[PDB]
Symmetry: D3
Subunit: 281 residues, 6 copies
């Protein structure tokens, strides 16, 4: 239904109180987080990350939202990683109160455990920490002007966490070592060819196509989506992944009569009677 998928999107502004990002919601259930620091190619300082964390937490708890888009303001950059202008000498990035942070690690975890799909909408540069962020998103929609790469070994940094291992799970070990060791830039076609992004579209149609992809997911079962996301994380995240996968199993079990009987019996101060529930093979 292209008429539905390509219908106009009406964004409602929810940016009140944010300084470094914009946060918007569509009537049909898309939340969009936009890094708004185009002057530094949308690099994040600790405040930026803090605000993205708050926005993503809101999206998670808004039961009208089914999908999140992460993007950068303007056409030149999605995100250029940590703001090197505030990178201190004592183990992180300094906020205005002098505290050193590495809070993008919290945001990565939050994207990972979000039960709703998160989509990176990438125009122009997705570089360094900004590159890890697009990789963390479940899907990436790239404009034909998109440019991807890491710079760690050039700028005195590295992401040896999901920035390395998870990258290898997307593009394979040979490509991952190349990306990290040489710190070249890759155009959208190169990214597409290596399986790094899901599709490449003309810059002009970036939001149009991204919104179609979100709407396709919004037609589907939110329960199935969250279970599948956990299951896919589970191939990577050991017990942390089991926590997500089993957690959803618990939720489901709480919705059954057998599970509910355990609760009722406790509340009614009696023994449970699980005999009425047939054992499946």
């Amino acid at each position: 239904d292209e008429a539905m998928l390509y219908a106009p999107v009406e964004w409602h502004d929810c940016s009140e109180g944010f300084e470094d990002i914009r946060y918007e919601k569509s009537t049909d259930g898309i939340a969009k987080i936009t890094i708004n620091r185009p002057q530094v190619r949308n690099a994040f300082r600790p405040l930026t990350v803090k605000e993205m964390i708050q926005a993503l937490a809101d999206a998670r708890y808004d039961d009208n939202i089914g999908v999140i888009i992460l993007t950068g303001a303007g056409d030149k950059a999605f995100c250029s990683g940590g703001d090197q202008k505030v990178r201190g000498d004592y183990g992180g990035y300094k906020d205005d109160s002098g505290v050193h942070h590495l809070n993008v690690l919290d945001f990565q975890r939050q994207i990972r455990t979000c039960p709703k799909p998160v989509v990176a909408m990438v125009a122009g540069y997705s570089i360094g920490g900004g590159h890890v962020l697009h990789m963390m998103c479940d899907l990436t929609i790239a404009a034909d002007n998109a440019i991807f790469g890491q710079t760690g070994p050039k700028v005195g940094s590295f992401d040896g966490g999901w920035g390395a291992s998870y990258m290898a799970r997307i593009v394979g070990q040979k490509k991952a070592r190349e990306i990290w060791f040489l710190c070249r830039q890759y155009d959208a076609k190169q990214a597409l060819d290596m399986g790094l992004v899901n599709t490449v579209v003309p810059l002009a149609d970036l939001e149009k196509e991204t919104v179609r992809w979100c709407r396709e997911m919004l037609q589907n079962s939110p329960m199935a989506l969250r279970c599948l996301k956990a299951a896919l994380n589970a191939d990577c995240d050991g017990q942390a992944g089991l926590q997500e996968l089993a957690g959803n199993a618990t939720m489901l079990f709480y919705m059954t009569e057998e599970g509910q009987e355990g609760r009722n019996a406790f509340n009614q101060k009696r023994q449970p009677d699980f005999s009425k529930f047939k054992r499946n093979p």
Copy 2:
């Protein structure tokens, strides 16, 4: 309730067709598989394993059975492992047709994936392949005359699968290397002290205590039990463990109105409407 836990048990014989084992079921939902080759300390030959497999399959599919006991005939042996008298040169144990088998590997997987708890009831020797068998069982109830250990490096064999890795998940890596490398025998107290068995009871009380443990589990949620068994396997078995765990999540999802709407929609040749189901955080 001790009166209920220690009530007499009435075994019904279901051994029709078996030559190397006995197979029985209680009215209150316990299936018991007994290796019946005491003349060889209950060593298994390929036929024996084939029968244990058939029995355990029957127990899986009988919706009145909730727990399975595995044990050996007599008081002298649980199982002394592969019957070395029929072990061929061509990579396995010879059946009367001359085919070389290692079908205990199938029995290990079957116990592993059985959605009902399997309890090893050990009197006397649990040795070699027979020792791996008790380990594979979810729980082990040991008589005070029980003796445990491996013999592989002494008799020209080894179990480098669950017989090694899973043993280490039970007794730790130092004890596991000790048990394998030296091939000593360990008595019941030594076994309990290392976490190898769940409890040790006087030989005369062996079945009485095992049935008590079985009955305590039979009071509990069968769904919960199978989910937890899968979850505990999943700490060991990677994607195979995910298959089990996720498979249970799939079963539970099928029992929800959200999952059912998806089926209904397809059968009625219409679009699913999941909008009616609230998204949890």
Copy 3:
């Protein structure tokens, strides 16, 4: 040797007793399992699965068979997954007796642990559970009319087991999330491009090329093939994978003089003497 590789194939029917599938063997060592429910696009019901499990067990134990082909009858579908017409409310698919099954999980594990290569021969739709089946097969040969995808989030289901994790080990995490979250369909070239199938051939050439691939494997060491298949599973299946791989090492050890000395000594009531066997570095 194209003459040999493209020689005519001579199928012998072994379907007697099967209601939902065909089962055939070639003189040169190929067993072929064909889902035969074209009226439902080769959707499996619980009987279908039980028969496929019986057929694959037969092929495993037939020492003349070296390779298995799995395919769908006709040219419109390989398999469309679980039969939604018989999917019950109580956690699975109803058989004629009203028992609720998810027995395709058994069949997945059987393909996985089969020591002989299994080849999916896909014409037309490989969808849902039927898509996971082709993925489980070691290799996939696709016709130019082949169509691939999942539908779980559309039809209220999910495979978060090998259907998710193992999919990711084939096409990468970005593609896996796309496939599962959007539930689009993908044509043969799309599947080839993402590494989902091994090759794409004109529909007319489907069996001809599949049989060629089978015959190439049939020239190779059956022992090496099974060790390698276990080794590749072991990158995914944790301790379950070690069981497979170590289990083959045991088989091999049994074929050595050192291994046999262990057995010989036990049978001959003497202490083993391993001094004759040089310690390799």
Copy 4:
């Protein structure tokens, strides 16, 4: 130095705005989170968990805190798990707004990823979700009146995430399956013997001994502790564990001259000169 270790402790309150918990800080760097619903054996409702999350976030960000204690009010209970009185049918526990939560999962991950040691101080009952909470804590100090166990299969629930797998990494797979399948209660001595808690002390000495253990850690390198905690999580949590461990490596790298040259060169818009930094073997 026992005089230092057993010095009186001086708690200052930081509970402003909390209804379900108390939150306090000692003058020497210990924070203490106390579940304060002793009338229901310190069962948590969604609000309770939310408050615990806020308190733990505070402790994490307070650089004068080096260690956190988790405990329950009164002598009778540490925590009895999820509050069954507010457990709803729709897959979680209802807050006053009707939303269904499983937010203890967030708290579990927050304890896990906390860079500071978290110590469970257990008096009386640690049961169900309350038992998983003490397990998640790095260390457990138990009073002689402490009682441990799970109840899931009895009350229609299960924790198949860290509550299962991680439990196995503490007590081993045999005890873990016993604990979950039978849902017995275990006294302090039983807990100590299976390795489930670190020490058992007289109830009268619980706080004094817990504070001693805390002070011992407070004498040590905070950086070394966080790295080790991450490293120990990493044996369980796959790529999520790598995120923590590598994250600490990044922090350290940012404190070296080599890392800083990378940053300086970027800010100064010149090529970095890494050649002046000797390559270690």
Copy 5:
């Protein structure tokens, strides 16, 4: 800077004492190990491996070297694997003294744990054990005449270690099973298409391009490069990977004032004072 990247390279010979290989170093920090047995398509015998290990150890310990190239003499072969003419019956390859070796396993490990990037420069055949060798190298630069493949199942062998699992992490599980099961040969384009090599260049420009890639890495942080290599290994090598990654964290910690205070306090026979180092969030 292409002028710099494509500048002449000045090799100096360091082959003194080697019989099967050449070993050279450039003034700008590239070490090159060349298998020199072109008469047997650069197959390795145990001495060849021994020599390669010695050269790679020398490269690791030379603080002037930052990158290693592995290659074969001539342009017909990179390496055709183990030398079958000296392959013994007793489980390995015979040296002149009749000891049977599989020492390529040590060389694989040594490439894996080398803190400096290792680059396969492939002209002609990279086959069998020789194909596993290029896979182990972090990157592969292939000439347009390069040919890739395994032969194990044809020549009575298999690499079920990194040869299998790590191959799957490169090309995906479907392509890995194809490569191993059929033992076909793949041209440079096929290899590139499946992600098996990083780039393909004209044969006459093989070294020129390889040296360029090396110089690009040689501009980057050696510390970042070794941490990332370890992090990428860590997604595959479980605890051995943790050893590498954490071992780099230890190295970095030693370079900090906090870590040094621990050493200073010990050497000065006083108690450490870690209180001066602020805790980061």
Copy 6:
């Protein structure tokens, strides 16, 4: 026979060329490496480690040696870890040439990958890096005066590799966190009780009992021993563990006629004929 087990041991000196260690061999197949720096409680400097690696390589290749003992000179210390007197600021311990090493990491991997059992014979202190060394050994025989612990967080170091993860696989996650975070010392009984060492014997009986354990293993299959050691590593070491396990499978395959046919056919320039080797199930 106890007469055999407790027979006198004749040590022959092989220490020529060593400065920091002694190296001796028994006539019945035991190699003993003794750290010889009692004046610093047998702390290792880079030369010490280099010597131990040389000694262990020699033991690996001496086909008369079946088991290695690692120990410390005198009765006061096994090993107190890294020599803090030569620990430099630049990420390692300085040799006489000023190079900074962490070469114990090499020795750890060498113990891990040694195909012969390695036994720690511990009298007195096993502390720090010295404690990790005893853990790495397959088994530990402790004297009643033995003391165990880590000191990292006190002395500005950590071993977050095998020092952490592998310790947890020995003593469990709760104890492992205790040991690392508090840096207490533990007597021999405490070590035994937590599963940290295999046995405790009177100091005067240390070598006598250690040699008995050694001789017990020396009676068993060297091949079974090495396969089992690999299999147990494989529960921990991911693909590095697969390499060892599969590597052993390859060695065994080379000893079979099916394997050898592949080699013979290649050497005789003819097609292999594997049809003579029946396919096991």
